[PDB]
Design a protein around this ligand. Structure first.
Ligand SMILES: Nc1ncnc2c1ncn2[C@@H]1O[C@H](COP(=O)(O)OP(=O)(O)NP(=O)(O)O)[C@@H](O)[C@H]1O
Ligand SMILES: Nc1ncnc2c1ncn2[C@@H]1O[C@H](COP(=O)(O)OP(=O)(O)NP(=O)(O)O)[C@@H](O)[C@H]1O
Ligand SMILES: [Mg+2]
Ligand SMILES: [Mg+2]
Lengths: 480, 458, 157, 52, 128, 466, 128
């Protein structure tokens, strides 16, 4: 009856409801269907409103009443969401009851401009040796994780989340990193197993999981990244630091392509719409480092892209590379050989992370970067015999198991041994075994040196000489 | 309420209703026709008209012909009485044995289990087959891609799986023929009768059959996997079982979805597939899972179009698979049955954490020694000769007589428990049976029979 | 392409020309492995005609299949039987070329018309290895096989 | 000495060539299939555009 | 007629590619939605309805049979084009013919490695 | 007077007017927004209704919402007080430093300089970058394009050029950020404050900044290049001074056009692009030009979708350029930076009558040996270099040394190379490649030629190795 | 004008690829439905009517002539593409240039085998 605040469904059946009335509805306003489903006013036309439906369209019929909410599509945000699993709209799906959040943020809010920002300067530590040394990530940065199916992509993200426990157990809110894991297009079982893993590692308490899975309607999968991002921006704009993982943006793009073809928008490359770049660009631009006048907070993003057969030159892969600040490339061939994490060092890049690396790591990793770059063409004369001998042992130090991300000072200690030449006489096949034996030695015995490196963020001449003696005396002690 | 046909264009039929419209997915019954014609609502077009997809042929239909809204999606017989029977997509018997007399009926469109219903427990579904259990084990609630064409013992593997899961665990099976060739649907039915997995004289049948034959409209072939899923869901959600669901073929499920999308005028996506390719797949696959009540595990025969593994169809399907069974002609011609390639077949639950430490090591040892044997085929020392004879005995101990192939051969078929399999290959890797002959390991069950085959034939 | 693809079924004889062949200076640019005729039948043209035609097609298909392998691994890797089929095939490819009277403005050669009898004999002899000793180019852009012999003599000095 | 060296060197070079051929087969098969898919998609987009 | 009266018949459809082209003409001109290669969504259904009618009947229904040999024309060997894919999937087996075998002297130009009969041995005499 | 919104879909807003209809290109002002929302008239639809393109987000718009006609196209501040400032698409200050109090404004739509206004002056602009200076030299007042796929080196190259050209240049610069990273704008702005090319305390700034990045909706991304151009046009014409114009990235203009075209309901062209791709590009590019009145040396970074140079966007851009630097992912992956394709980068001044026969001969000689190496790739990929003739092995060895000597450490890329940046005089570039071609360094190892400046560094590097 | 008044003119169209693009725009915006590569159904006729007007006149009509050198830009060197073969199929020959040849030092970069003249020696002096 109230044609200004309410309307009636004219037609439904291509993911879009056409609604008569709603004369006062705003562009991109959330509306509510009789069934309890939500929708977004997309198309304002003279005689109807085109509504994108955030659920199954079986639940909408011609004649159904549709109501204004008065609000541009938004989601709950706040600390109340920590420890919770929510759908794309921010409703609890973990059966743990109401979420107390009072504040809300628009999912489509434009990223901060030039002036509110400052260069990324603070380390975002993954606890993964290969990443923190050679592909360092800063707070505010966007770093793409990219590779074929089952190459270890999610595992990078999970270890990074688990890693933050050491800072989050502290009391300094500036050093803390609150996490958001966005599952898009995944199996529900996979997400469940994920939260179980996080819970076991005591990481769930500082993590929000947003989930729009394989059986959720495409508009929910489309929405999920934006919703999670708004939950992240809450931290960014509150002077704190958040990390968001979009797992994965390939499936989101597929969901958007479904919506777009059903809307009969003209397709291009691989039948994707012309705004598929913008879909990802507007999202990832929102990961940012804020200047002190804006509170000094940050949002770091790790979007995930799945390649077909290692082809990074395809449309969606190149789109996201042209957005993010570098990539971590995981390679099937390496994964197959047992190289884990399966990171291709040479093909991986951090465009802005070096300024967000501790001096301690900057030292030993810069020379490892050099010694590996001099190894990627020799892989016998004595001049190249040393370059090969060093490179295989350094490659062994870059191997790492899951679920045990490493303190930066522990990473600096293991890399120190290989770079300074304390592995040269040892055989390549026994390096992995040496490392774990060496690590338990420095932790149990020399906490004073590891603590000092951690605090100072640098290896001074006193620290360098002290560490020289420890590795020498352990190398003589280490037999088999 | 009663509507009227206003349009018929091939397998697409539009129906106008005077009062309340039937929701999308509701089954409509066309009045005044010899057999049963179901129309599934796909869209609300506006002006009191719905667009539907037909489940059978639409010839002879007249504009104005009466159509009844059933009040629900397609509803099919569910229960113990489905076992041994063949039904179609709308739940009608097609084996000429009369009504399927269940005490319950169920809608074929059902939401996948919710997040809270998920099980984090990773469990091996023991098949009792040595090649599978050891090297590429099935996971409860998981999906297994079955590769290989014909002549590689596909149906016998399927029938033995049905036989073994019912025998070892006590769980039943459901076979969904998606785009079933009518000739091959007849063959399978009579082969199942011969093997004993279907019994026409008592209630001991182990499989329920659901057929969506090739000559049926796109709508029927698209929904028949859901019908099979619904039969399986009863045994899980009402009887707490670990159920097996076979889908033959998953590509034909995708293909039928593409055809339906085309017929509804939806713009094709990449390579001509439906824009809803991933959601069509997801809403179906996510119903196959482990819940608190039980699990549905699915073996899905995979066709790879143009032998292109990056083709949208197999690529989208691969996202849902947890394991592969690769049936090989090379393995078949070597006389090893089942003809499962022991190196190509993989499983996500082959992990020292999920399966035992004893399970992982032995299986990794079997993999290494088979790859090293292939390396030494090109070219030996005392260590190399030892690894060659060990691996050749491993190749044979991977073979197995099946219970399903007992009347055909006469050779006693074997179901081998998990720990018997692990310790069997463990005793060969250790060289404990390199004292004994090689061909004593061919076509036997538990290792105790391979010792006896050497004790008898010495 | 739908237009030519649909045309094939309306014909009794098909002459398929190829840019890949024209590019080599082989005129007329007829693809000998993609041109067909209803009357290419031993019961219509006789066994001699049919045998030579199929022999020519076989040698050319054998060479075509080898070209790419020898382009990478080299001629010296071929067996004597293979390099004999190579040299003869290349002579056969050339003897299929012919100066047309209407093409004198393009070829610089006087046009030639070759009787069917002479066409059969000429290819028969090349297939039989009767001109293995003659250079390749002697066979290019001539009429009857006698001109190839005469051209070979002229090519000496 | 020469033939022992020559036979080893040929064995070596051919092993590497066969490996290079393998990697090229994979690379070409991938190019083939991307082109295969693109051709189908492009044709369909032209048909849809003409119909709309 | 022969199938249903206890007799055996053989039908050749030469060819089903051309039948599909005729149906496509009608569908497009009826403004039915085009798909891959402009064929309609029921083009599989067209051929499956036809080819499923070939059958071997049991003794109860007379014991008669209808055998079908459909013909498909491919373009430049593309057995994965839309119509070939459909009819390959529908049938019980395929005899694949190739141009380079034809001109090599392999006539009939059957690719023995790729061709298949899923009925196989069941259809052969003991002598064969 | 006043209009009312009748339809909204993304960037496209239809507005009905009761009295007097705004002409195409007029800026309309949406009433009641917290920040200025401009709609640009694109079409007259009939029935007193116009179709417009929004310059910012359209969320929150309601049918019936009032819209006023400003009586002019988008007008922006132009003049000396744009220097040191950052503006957005509509000429608003976005640097928090208050009003841009120029004495003049200019419409962002202007007609291209006429044929009579063209300059035929062709003078070399030495960059100190070996590949460019040798093979495809830039010209003063010329149009330069930098083609590249995702991550290959477009922005690093444009930043090195700002380092090598702008300081040697005597005039003003304009940088237009078009659909790129906002954080790259933050980096550039603050680095310019640090170096002093932007002075916040004095009127001594030499650079004007205009930004509409990849966080912006497509209307803004489609028009922001015009905003940048307009600023440069003023300095070229009303000051008759040498101007440098840097644009990162001009592809984003065409991509944004594709997004709006889809919303305008046009029948799409090839690859889903707007049917107006070429004319839209022409009307914009023809303004980016030197005239008899003043010089614009323009450098435009050009993104290449899926690395496909035949994509309608980059393919149509080529003919708008006097010099092209085409980057290659394959080359980057081999470690050659800058990743310039030496056989796909061209210049109108690569002419013996312009650069002299010595320059020309060495350039063509380098390209011949590289092409000869290229068309052996098939056989090398299978059998390796050891199967080739001695003649071909010689050409492969020299070509590989030339490939490496074409690489160069950039002052801007020091974190990534690990080497101090190098700038090489033109005469030294000519001499170095001349000597390699002559076989003067046939004895030296290939790696000696990698990541150096002048040829003497390659000699010194080889001496340390052996 | 020259052609019809006993004089001889040469005309260069640089280039017809860009003319086809401008015509495609107009046609799409007139809402005429696109064909191959979004070009209008009669993109051939656009160039064929233009190029047919280049002609040699008999003595009755003055004996004058108009010679045309149209220019076509290929992408990735594909002379066998749609629009290129359209225009090749209009003209009395073509001069085909390639980047490979260009950088090898073959300048002018003419591919001999792929270039043709359809008039031949009739357009040459006896000396040539
Ligand atoms: N560092 C590691 N060491 C050992 N195993 C690992 C490591 N990282 C990952 N894995 C295992 O590798 C498998 C795949 O890793 P996962 O993190 O799921 O990659 P993915 O690319 O996200 N897979 P998907 O999303 O299914 O395509 C899992 O079984 C992990 O347990
Ligand atoms: N000249 C160079 N020397 C060394 N490294 C380089 C050079 N150019 C590019 N790189 C590497 O490539 C990365 C990306 O360079 P950049 O110039 O930003 O590429 P781009 O083509 O502008 N990428 P995008 O804007 O995302 O399409 C840098 O961070 C370096 O790691
Ligand atoms: Mg993952
Ligand atoms: Mg860039």
């Amino acid at each position: 009856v109230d044609l200004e605040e309410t309307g009636r469904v004219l037609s439904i059946g291509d993911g879009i409801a056409r609604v008569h009335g709603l004369r006062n509805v705003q562009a991109e306003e959330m509306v509510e269907f009789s069934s309890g489903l939500k929708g977004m006013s997309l198309n304002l036309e003279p005689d109807n409103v085109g509504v994108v439906v955030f659920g199954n369209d079986k639940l909408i019929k011609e004649g159904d009443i549709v109501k204004r909410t008065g609000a541009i599509v938004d989601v709950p945000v706040g600390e109340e969401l920590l420890g919770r699993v929510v759908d794309a709209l921010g409703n609890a799906i973990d059966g743990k009851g109401p979420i107390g959040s009072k504040a809300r943020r628009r999912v489509g809010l434009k990223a901060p401009g030039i002036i509110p920002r400052i260069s990324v300067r603070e380390p975002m530590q993954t606890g993964i040796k290969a990443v923190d040394s050679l592909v360092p990530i800063g707070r505010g940065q966007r770093e793409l994780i990219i590779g074929d199916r089952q190459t270890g992509k999610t595992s990078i993200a999970i270890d990074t989340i688990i890693n933050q426990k050491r800072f989050n157990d502290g009391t300094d809110e500036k050093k803390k990193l609150y996490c958001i894991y966005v599952a898009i297009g995944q199996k529900r079982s996979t997400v469940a197993q994920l939260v179980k893993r996080l819970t076991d590692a005591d990481a769930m308490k500082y993590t929000i999981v947003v989930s729009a899975t394989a059986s959720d309607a495409a508009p929910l999968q489309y929405l999920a990244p934006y919703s999670g991002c708004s939950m992240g921006e809450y931290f960014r704009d509150n002077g704190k630091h958040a990390l968001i993982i979009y797992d994965d943006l390939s499936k989101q793009a597929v969901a958007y392509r479904q919506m777009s073809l059903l809307l009969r928008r003209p397709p291009g490359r691989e039948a994707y719409p012309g705004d598929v770049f913008y879909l990802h660009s507007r999202l990832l631009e929102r990961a940012a480092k804020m200047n002190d006048a804006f509170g000094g907070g940050s949002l770091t993003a790790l979007p995930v892209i799945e390649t077909q057969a290692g082809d990074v030159s395809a449309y969606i892969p190149t789109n996201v590379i042209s957005i993010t600040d570098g990539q971590i490339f995981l390679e099937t061939e390496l994964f197959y050989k047992g190289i884990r994490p399966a990171i291709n060092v040479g093909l991986s890049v951090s465009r802005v992370g070096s300024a967000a690396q501790t001096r301690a790591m900057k030292q030993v990793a810069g020379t490892m970067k050099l010694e590996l770059a001099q190894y990627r063409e020799v892989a016998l004369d004595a001049a190249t015999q040393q370059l090969l001998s060093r490179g295989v042992r350094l490659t062994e130090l870059l191997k790492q198991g899951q679920y045990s991300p490493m303190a930066i000072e522990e990473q600096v200690a293991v890399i120190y041994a290989g770079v300074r030449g304390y592995l040269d006489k040892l055989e390549p096949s026994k390096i992995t075994k040496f490392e774990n034996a060496f690590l338990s030695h420095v932790i149990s015995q020399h906490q004073a040196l590891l603590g000092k490196i951690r605090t100072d963020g640098k290896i001074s001449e006193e620290s360098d000489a002290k560490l020289k003696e420890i590795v020498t005396n352990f190398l003589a002690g280490f037999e088999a | 309420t009663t509507g009227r046909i206003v349009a018929v264009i091939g397998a697409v039929v539009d129906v106008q209703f005077d009062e309340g419209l039937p929701p999308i997915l509701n089954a409509l019954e066309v009045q005044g026709r010899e057999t049963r014609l179901v129309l599934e609502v796909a869209q609300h077009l506006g002006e009191s008209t719905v667009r539907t997809i037909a489940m059978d042929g639409t010839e002879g239909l007249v504009r104005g012909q009466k159509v009844l809204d059933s009040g629900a999606p397609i509803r099919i017989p569910v229960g113990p009485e489905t076992l041994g029977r063949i039904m179609n997509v709308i739940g009608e018997p097609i084996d000429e044995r009369g009504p399927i007399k269940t005490k319950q009926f169920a809608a074929i469109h059902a939401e996948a289990p919710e997040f809270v219903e998920m099980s984090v427990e990773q469990e091996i579904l023991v098949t009792g087959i040595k090649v599978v259990d050891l090297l590429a084990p099935y996971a409860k609630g998981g999906k297994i891609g079955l590769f290989g064409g014909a002549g590689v013992g596909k149906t016998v593997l399927i029938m033995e799986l049905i036989n073994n899961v019912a025998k070892a665990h006590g769980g039943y099976s459901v076979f969904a023929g998606v785009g079933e060739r009518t000739r091959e649907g007849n063959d399978l039915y009579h082969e199942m009768i011969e093997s004993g997995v279907i019994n026409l004289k008592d209630a001991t049948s182990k499989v329920a059959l659901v057929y969506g034959q090739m000559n049926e409209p796109p709508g029927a072939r698209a929904r028949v996997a859901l019908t099979g899923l619904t039969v399986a869901e009863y045994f899980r959600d009402q009887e707490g079982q670990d159920v097996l669901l076979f889908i033959d073929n998953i590509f034909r499920f995708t293909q039928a979805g593409s055809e339906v999308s085309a017929l509804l005028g939806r713009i094709p996506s990449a390579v001509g597939y439906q824009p809803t390719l991933a959601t069509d797949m997801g809403t179906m696959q996510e119903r196959i899972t482990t819940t608190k009540k039980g699990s549905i595990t699915s073996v899905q025969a995979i066709y790879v179009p143009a032998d292109d593994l990056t083709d949208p169809a197999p690529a989208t399907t691969f996202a849902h698979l947890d394991a592969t069974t690769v049936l090989s002609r090379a393995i078949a011609e070597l006389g090893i049955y089942p003809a499962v390639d022991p190196l190509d077949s993989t499983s996500r639950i082959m992990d020292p954490n999920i399966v035992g430490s004893e399970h992982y090591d032995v299986a990794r040892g079997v993999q290494k020694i088979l790859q090293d044997y292939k390396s030494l085929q090109d070219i030996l020392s005392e260590e190399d000769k030892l690894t060659v004879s060990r691996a050749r005995k491993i190749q044979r101990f991977l073979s197995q007589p099946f219970q399903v192939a007992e009347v055909f051969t006469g050779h006693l078929g074997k179901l081998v428990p998990l720990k018997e399999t692990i310790k069997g290959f463990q005793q060969i890797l250790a060289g404990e049976y390199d004292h004994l002959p090689e061909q004593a390991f061919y076509m036997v069950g538990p290792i105790e029979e391979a010792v006896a085959k050497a004790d008898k034939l010495a | 392409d739908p237009a030519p693809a649909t045309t094939f079924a309306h014909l009794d004889a098909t002459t398929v020309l190829s840019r890949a062949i024209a590019e080599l200076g082989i005129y007329p640019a007829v693809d000998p492995l993609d041109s067909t005729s209803r009357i290419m039948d031993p019961n219509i043209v006789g066994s001699e005609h049919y045998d030579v035609a199929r022999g020519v097609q076989k040698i050319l298909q054998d060479y075509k299949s080898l070209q790419d392998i020898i382009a990478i691994l080299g001629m010296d890797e071929l067996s004597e039987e293979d390099k004999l089929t190579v040299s003869r095939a290349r002579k056969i490819q050339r003897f299929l070329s012919q100066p047309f009277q209407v093409a004198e403005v393009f070829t610089g050669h006087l046009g030639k018309l070759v009787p069917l009898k002479e066409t059969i004999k000429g290819f028969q002899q090349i297939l039989a290895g009767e001109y293995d000793h003659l250079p390749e180019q002697a066979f290019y852009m001539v009429g009857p096989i006698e001109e190839a012999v005469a051209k070979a003599d002229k090519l000496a000095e | 000495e020469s033939t022992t060296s020559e036979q080893s060197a040929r064995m070596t070079a051919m092993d590497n060539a066969s490996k290079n051929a393998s990697e090229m087969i994979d690379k070409l098969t991938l190019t083939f299939n991307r082109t295969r898919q693109a051709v189908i998609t492009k044709e369909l987009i032209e048909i849809i555009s003409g119909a709309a």
